[PDB]
Structures are given as structure tokens and as C-alpha cells.
């Protein structure tokens, strides 16, 4: 774990079968359109995959079609300018700062906000080392509330 | 963070045949550990190991003969010339008559004796005796 203690090995393990499940006679001719419609209706790719697994019964979009969900979203041009995890971290930091402004006596909240901003800086450094984020992206803490956009 | 995979592999091997369990599971397989294991095999220190090739950087199960006194890695992988082979050997191995100091060389994984007989010493990997 990045901060604190606890190994917490809870996760999801993909099946050995890499290919599309045999019982799925469904055709991949419209699964990408389904995810595109879902993203248009407004869903982050994580919950797009979750909704696809639950309500559509088509696990491992990568197995159904040899291309992964955020990748097809980018290929269609729908993908957001800020990656999902970084945006969620920014939202958490914005909420925490909004709370702290009212309660400056919340030392624990201040500490965890420092931790969250450290994570934000590390992951933004990674994303701008890749070309997934503009080189001038900084995350100043003043206008992050509207930076979600 | 595992850092070195072969170090953990050899430490697990060592603990295993110190316990004398005759069969040991090495979880993070790699090509380097595979070649190290084949060299140990060809020198007769282990049996017929089989790599369980799952879709997830699979594992290895190796049969032990109760035959290895100690296998270990050398970290960092010091680059050794052909000249300092003797200096490393008299400091690492228990005798000049048995034991193997494993080098990675421009011509692959090999021990000190055949590295000498083929020239071109390289980087040190580990040892077993």
C-alpha cells in the first residue's frame, strides 16, 4: 500500500481463457457502439466496464474484441483530457479542501489532503512523462475546483 | 518491491533444500532464472524442473536431490574481467575442486571454469555448491 499499512491483496483475477467465452454467441459488431453510447451518456471507463459486465454479460471487453475500452474510447475521440484516476484524485482533493476551509481544525483531514496531493503530483508527473497530459499541466490548488470541467 | 527475481528464486531454493522438502515452487519465473536452473541441472544439483506457464509470468516447480549445499545470488552484478576470476573464486567458492560461480557473459550464462575455457568473462550472477 502506498500510504499507511495493510497489504490488502483483494483484487480481481482474470480467467486463464484469453479468448471470447464460447457460450457468448454475441457478435462484437456492436459492443464498441454500446460502450460509446454509454460514455456519451456519461460514464467513466471503469464504470463502463462494470455496467458492461453486469447488465450486458460481456466480461473482458479485451476478450470480446482485441482492443481495450479506454483505447477504443480514445480511437473514437471520446476520452477525457484528464485520465480517470487523476481526475478522481483531483475531485477528492477539491472536496477535502472545501471541507478544510470550513474546519481548519481538522488536522487529520489536512494530513490526508497532503497525502492525496502527493499522489496527485506523482501520477500527474507520470501522465505528463507520457504524452497523456500537456507539458504545462501543473495542478495549482487554487482553480482545481473548476479544473474538473 | 521484489527488485531482483533470481535472488528470491535462489533464496527459496536454499530454504527448501535446507528443509529437505524435495520439491519447491518458485513463483516469479523468468528466462534468467530458467537458464540458471538449467545450468544447475547440467551440473547435477537439481532434477527435472517444470515451468507452469500460465498467462501471468508463470511459476516453476523444481525437484531437489538433497544435493546442493548453498545456492545464492551476488548483488550487485559486478562486471568481472577474465583476470579477476581467480580473485572472485578463492573468495566465494569453498574449494578449487568443486562449486560453481555463475557469470553472465557475452556468450550466455556459464560458470567460471567454462568462462575461462571460452575466454570473455562478464558480469557475476551467483554461485552454488
Amino acid at each position: 500500500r502506498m500510504y499507511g499499512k495493510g497489504k490488502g491483496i483483494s483484487s480481481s483475477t482474470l480467467p486463464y481463457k484469453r479468448k471470447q467465452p464460447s457460450w457468448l454467441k454475441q457478435k462484437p459488431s456492436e459492443i464498441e457502439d454500446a460502450i460509446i453510447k454509454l460514455a456519451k451518456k456519461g460514464q467513466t471507463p471503469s464504470q463502463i466496464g462494470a455496467t458492461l459486465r453486469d447488465n450486458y454479460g460481456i466480461p473482458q471487453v479485451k476478450s470480446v474484441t482485441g482492443n481495450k475500452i479506454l483505447r477504443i474510447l480514445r480511437a473514437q475521440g471520446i476520452a477525457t483530457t484528464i485520465p480517470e484516476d487523476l481526475y478522481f484524485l483531483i475531485k477528492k482533493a477539491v472536496s477535502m479542501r472545501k471541507h478544510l476551509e470550513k474546519n481548519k481544525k481538522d488536522k487529520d483531514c489536512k494530513f490526508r489532503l497532503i497525502l492525496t496531493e502527493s499522489k496527485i503530483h506523482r501520477i500527474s508527473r507520470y501522465y505528463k512523462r507520457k504524452k497523456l497530459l500537456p507539458s504545462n499541466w501543473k495542478y495549482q490548488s487554487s482553480t482545481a475546483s473548476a479544473l474538473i470541467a | 518491491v521484489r527488485m531482483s527475481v533470481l535472488a528470491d528464486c535462489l533464496k527459496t531454493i536454499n530454504n527448501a533444500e535446507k528443509r529437505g522438502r524435495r520439491q519447491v515452487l518458485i513463483r516469479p519465473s523468468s528466462k534468467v532464472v530458467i537458464k540458471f536452473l538449467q545450468y544447475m541441472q547440467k551440473k547435477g544439483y537439481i532434477g527435472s524442473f517444470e515451468i507452469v506457464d500460465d498467462h501471468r509470468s508463470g511459476k516453476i516447480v523444481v525437484n531437489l536431490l538433497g544435493r546442493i549445499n548453498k545456492c545464492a545470488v551476488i548483488s550487485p552484478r559486478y562486471d568481472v574481467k577474465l583476470d579477476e576470476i581467480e580473485k572472485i573464486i578463492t573468495s566465494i567458492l569453498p574449494s578449487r575442486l568443486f562449486g560453481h560461480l555463475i557469470l553472465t557473459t557475452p556468450y550466455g550464462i556459464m560458470d567460471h571454469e567454462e568462462a575461462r575455457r571460452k575466454h570473455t568473462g562478464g558480469k557475476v550472477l551467483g554461485f552454488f555448491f
Partner: protein
């Protein structure tokens, strides 16, 4: 791990650690601190000539009981007052009150030796005549 950086590019860290840490032992600090030249009276010399000021008896340590016969020497090289032990049974009588005397260390560098407290030097010859040549036997000529 091991407590030390073992990486193939950790030579800077290891070297700096050793450089800082060698100041922690008495030997290296004593041999490499610039203080020694000004602190010790011999200024790094093995021997020194001086002028006898007077003779004094110094108490031995508590377990023993003796009056070690030492002399107070004004070093001509610097002008420092030192105390030098006079070896031998009746060698104090062999030295007068205003003579040139050659003194050396007591064998433990700057440390006291035996039950004698605070004495770090010993007389080796007076009036350029050896105390050994005067005491153990009169094999050499007497006092000039």
C-alpha cells in the same frame, strides 16, 4: 537488507559515509586533526632539548606509594614547561639545576605511564652525556 547501499552506482554514498565516519575513531582523529602540532610540546618531534628549571618529587598513584623523581624542563625550541621523569636509582643527583637535557616520550605517545600521573616525557641524557652511561655502570665518563 544490509544497512548500506549495495547498488552498482552507490560508490558516492559509500565513499562519503566512510569519509564522515572515520572521524569517529580516536586514531584517525588524533593523527589527522591539526590540533596536535600546537597541543603537543615536541611539535611532532621524537626528542627535544630543554633547560632544567628544578627537580620535583611526584606522588605515585594511590595503590602504590613512592616519590618519583622528575625534573621540570623549559624547552629551548618553544619555551614550554614540561615535566620529564628521570629513570635510574640515583640519577636525580646526576643532574644539576640549570643544565641542558635531552628528553623523549615516555613510550605511550601523549599518555601517562605507570603510577606516575601527568608525566609524558623522560630524560635520556644530560649535558650531552647519557643517563644510561651514568647509572647502570660508570662505563662512560662521569659528569663533565
Amino acid at each position: 537488507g544490509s544497512g548500506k547501499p549495495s547498488g552498482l552506482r552507490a560508490a558516492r554514498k559509500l565513499r562519503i559515509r566512510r569519509r564522515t565516519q572515520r572521524w569517529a575513531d580516536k586514531s584517525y582523529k588524533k593523527s589527522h586533526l591539526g590540533t596536535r602540532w600546537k597541543s603537543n610540546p615536541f611539535r611532532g618531534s621524537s626528542h627535544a632539548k630543554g633547560i632544567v628549571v628544578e627537580k620535583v618529587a611526584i606522588e605515585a598513584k594511590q595503590p602504590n606509594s613512592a616519590y618519583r623523581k622528575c625534573v621540570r624542563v623549559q624547552l629551548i625550541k618553544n619555551g614550554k614547561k614540561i615535566t620529564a621523569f628521570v629513570p635510574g636509582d640515583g640519577c636525580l643527583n646526576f643532574i644539576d639545576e640549570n643544565d641542558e637535557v635531552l628528553v623523549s616520550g615516555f613510550g605511550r605517545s601523549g599518555h601517562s605511564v605507570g603510577d606516575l600521573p601527568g608525566v609524558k616525557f623522560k630524560v635520556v641524557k644530560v649535558a650531552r652525556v647519557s643517563l644510561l652511561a651514568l647509572f647502570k655502570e660508570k662505563k662512560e665518563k662521569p659528569r663533565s
